[PDB]
Amino acid sequence: SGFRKMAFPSGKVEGCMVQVTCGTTTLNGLWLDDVVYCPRHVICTSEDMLNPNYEDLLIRKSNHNFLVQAGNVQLRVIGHSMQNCVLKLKVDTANPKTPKYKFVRIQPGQTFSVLACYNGSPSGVYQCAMRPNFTIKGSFLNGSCGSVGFNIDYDCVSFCYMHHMELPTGVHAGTDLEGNFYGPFVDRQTAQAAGTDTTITVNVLAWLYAAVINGDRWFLNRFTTTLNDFNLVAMKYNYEPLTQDHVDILGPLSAQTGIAVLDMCASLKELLQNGMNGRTILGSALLEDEFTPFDVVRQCSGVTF
Amino acid sequence: SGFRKMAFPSGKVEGCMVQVTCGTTTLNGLWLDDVVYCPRHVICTSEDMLNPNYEDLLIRKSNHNFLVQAGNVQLRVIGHSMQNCVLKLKVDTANPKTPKYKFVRIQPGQTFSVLACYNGSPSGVYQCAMRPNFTIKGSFLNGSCGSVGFNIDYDCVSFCYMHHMELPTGVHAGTDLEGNFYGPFVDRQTAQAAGTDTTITVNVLAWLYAAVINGDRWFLNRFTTTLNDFNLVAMKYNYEPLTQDHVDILGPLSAQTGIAVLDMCASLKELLQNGMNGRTILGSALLEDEFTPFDVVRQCSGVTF
Ligand SMILES: CC(C)(C)c1ccc(N(C(=O)c2c[nH]cn2)[C@@H](C(=O)NC2CCCCC2)c2cccnc2)cc1
Numbered sequence: 225s226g227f228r229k230m231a232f233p234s235g236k237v238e239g240c241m242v243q244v245t246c247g248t249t250t251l252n253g254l255w256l257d258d259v260v261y262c263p264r265h266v267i268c269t270s271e272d273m274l275n276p277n278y279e280d281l282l283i284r285k286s287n288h289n290f291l292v293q294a295g296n297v298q299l300r301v302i303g304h305s306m307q308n309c310v311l312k313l314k315v316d317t318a319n320p321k322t323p324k325y326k327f328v329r330i331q332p333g334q335t336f337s338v339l340a341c342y343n344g345s346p347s348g349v350y351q352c353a354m355r356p357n358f359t360i361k362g363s364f365l366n367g368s369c370g371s372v373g374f375n376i377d378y379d380c381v382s383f384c385y386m387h388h389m390e391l392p393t394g395v396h397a398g399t400d401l402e403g404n405f406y407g408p409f410v411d412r413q414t415a416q417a418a419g420t421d422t423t424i425t426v427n428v429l430a431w432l433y434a435a436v437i438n439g440d441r442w443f444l445n446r447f448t449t450t451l452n453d454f455n456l457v458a459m460k461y462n463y464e465p466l467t468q469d470h471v472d473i474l475g476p477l478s479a480q481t482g483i484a485v486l487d488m489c490a491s492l493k494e495l496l497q498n499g500m501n502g503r504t505i506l507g508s509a510l511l512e513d514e515f516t517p518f519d520v521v522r523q524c525s526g527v528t529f
Numbered sequence: 530s531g532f533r534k535m536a537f538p539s540g541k542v543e544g545c546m547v548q549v550t551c552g553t554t555t556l557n558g559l560w561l562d563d564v565v566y567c568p569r570h571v572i573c574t575s576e577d578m579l580n581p582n583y584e585d586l587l588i589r590k591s592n593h594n595f596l597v598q599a600g601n602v603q604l605r606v607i608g609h610s611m612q613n614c615v616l617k618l619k620v621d622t623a624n625p626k627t628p629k630y631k632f633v634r635i636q637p638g639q640t641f642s643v644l645a646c647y648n649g650s651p652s653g654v655y656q657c658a659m660r661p662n663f664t665i666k667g668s669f670l671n672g673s674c675g676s677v678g679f680n681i682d683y684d685c686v687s688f689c690y691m692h693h694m695e696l697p698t699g700v701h702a703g704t705d706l707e708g709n710f711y712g713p714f715v716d717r718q719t720a721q722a723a724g725t726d727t728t729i730t731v732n733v734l735a736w737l738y739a740a741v742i743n744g745d746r747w748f749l750n751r752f753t754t755t756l757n758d759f760n761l762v763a764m765k766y767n768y769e770p771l772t773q774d775h776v777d778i779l780g781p782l783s784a785q786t787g788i789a790v791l792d793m794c795a796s797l798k799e800l801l802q803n804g805m806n807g808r809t810i811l812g813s814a815l816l817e818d819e820f821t822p823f824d825v826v827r828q829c830s831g832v833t834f
């Protein structure tokens with residue numbers, strides 16, 4: 225028993241992290257087969273950040289302008305190209321540690337693990353969610369750019385996020401591994417702010433089920449509710465609409481605990497209206513929304529990789 | 530910026546996890562050089578748990594009674610011995626992935642990462658603390674036994690914990706890698722409960738500094754306090770005594786932020802007496818005590834491994 229913010233084991237991603245240097249800027253890159261993927265803003269200078277002309281900047285660059293280091297080993301760059309906001313550096317050595325992998329674009333509300341890196345070296349791993357406003361609330365310092373987010377399914381690493389930058393709000397923004405930003409953000413130093421975020425209702429519900437599985441049951445009330453009446457209340461507290469797909473997705477937790485989803489919705493309704501009155505749920509004084517239903521199932525059933 | 534519960538990258542420990550089977554019981558083992566370390570209760574049966582005679586049970590066991598699997602590869606056991614509550618199985622193949630490592634016994638209040646495993650396969654990684662009552666608040670299911678906790682310093686993995694069992698309270702107990710339990714607990718099915726836990730005051734203070742570094746400053750008041758007056762208040766709220774060693778250890782955070790430790794103590798005093806009044810700190814509605822000062826420094830300075 226117990227419940228923790230649990231990340232995927234990071235060993236498969238660790239063997240893919242390299243350091244990419246271009247002029248004075250260093251950041252991280254991802255090495256899969258004989259390609260290194262990293263943020264294109266590595267080719268910016270301090271004179272370039274407000275409105276870089278990325279095509280023009282790249283043109284003045286030779287392969288030899290790119291210094292790629294895997295640990296202490298230099299990898300020789302033999303090609304370079306730009307795909308959306310990502311650079312692809314073809315190198316003359318394929319990564320012998322390339323895992324089975326794919327590139328996916330995740331949906332707001334989904335979660336992934338982040339292997340934060342600096343100068344090509346791993347520093348820490350933590351679990352994140354794609355917020356409804358397409359930001360993530362990560363922990364990243366200067367030089368973290370190129371750190372990646374991933375899920376693991378079985379033996380296959382699905383890469384979903386590459387870190388590009390921090391917004392003035394202190395939240396973080398980036399791209400899928402095709403270089404397309406999540407949200408309306410751009411890789412230049414300009415005014416751009418996140419939309420108002422919202423609470424991932426289906427995740428909050430998944431977490432309430434995890435509480436019940438762990439024996440924390442005081443918030444369960446005697447009522448039910450309709451989907452429509454639940455959503456009118458939740459709207460007021462800045463919760464996202466719960467759809468029938470969300471309900472279906474909560475099926476495994478409802479079956480395990482015996483609590484119908486609409487019944488759990490009535491308990492959450494009461495928590496929103498009345499608060500928790502000093503009590504805690506799974507050691508938290510707040511409703512948590514960064515566990516998906518699948519995360520709860522996986523952590524309370526022991527899925528390994 | 531940002532602040533997360535951040536674990537150490539787990540790749541070095543992943544390459545050390547094996548499956549150990551003895552009769553019908555399976556659990557995890559740690560493979561370093563040509564030795565596999567695992568909990569001795571693997572040699573128990575369902576008829577043995579109340580008061581196992583471990584010496585007698587081990588005697589009736591041959592090397593061939595131990596099935597060790599690294600992935601799908603069987604490792605042949607060529608010796609076996611018992612050290613305190615841990616089994617040491619000498620195998621005929623040394624782990625080619627053995628990292629530089631040592632075994633340490635940690636102090637209450639310190640933190641470590643846990644690589645939770647099932648049947649020798651990694652499932653997730655999260656960060657934990659040794660509670661003052663020598664339990665840990667982990668996330669572990671049946672078969673997690675033998676999962677280990679560790680810190681990483683530079684290139685060296687310091688192993689500090691091996692998971693042995695769950696208490697009826699749902700908290701977890703285990704040993705150092707010499708097989709000596711943390712706390713008064715024993716590896717048998719008998720009545721044994723944790724002492725009353727307490728809050729790790731020096732950790733709470735480290736977390737308040739992390740808040741300030743991240744720009745969350747509303748709880749800072751205009752007062753100072755003496756160490757003695759602070760501890761009289763903290764005693765009431767079940768906080769541990771803050772010692773001068775704790776103050777010295779907070780030196781780097783005080784220097785970085787400009788806030789004297791005793792000044793930060795006056796702000797924490799007010800939070801204990803008045804509560805937070807609906808406000809949050811680093812996204813939490815509760816005071817967090819599972820970040821050590823070193824964790825804060827490392828996460829707000831980017832130390833890599
Ligand atoms: C050129 C461009 C696109 C404007 C840029 C500039 C700096 C960086 N940041 C690098 O740390 C970094 C950059 N190159 C190597 N390191 C940081 C970053 O985003 N500050 C933004 C701060 C608001 C104003 C725009 C820039 C950063 C800090 C913390 C976590 N994440 C990233 C990222 C992008």
Ligand SMILES: CC(C)(C)c1ccc(N(C(=O)c2c[nH]cn2)[C@@H](C(=O)NC2CCCCC2)c2cccnc2)cc1
Binds near residue numbers: 225570697
């Ligand atoms: C023989 C002995 C020492 C009594 C024992 C028995 C079972 C286990 N548990 C194994 O899961 C397990 C054991 N062997 C393979 N798996 C579980 C465990 O501790 N239940 C305790 C529950 C209270 C009463 C005593 C046993 C476990 C569950 C969840 C997380 N951690 C461990 C551990 C030790």
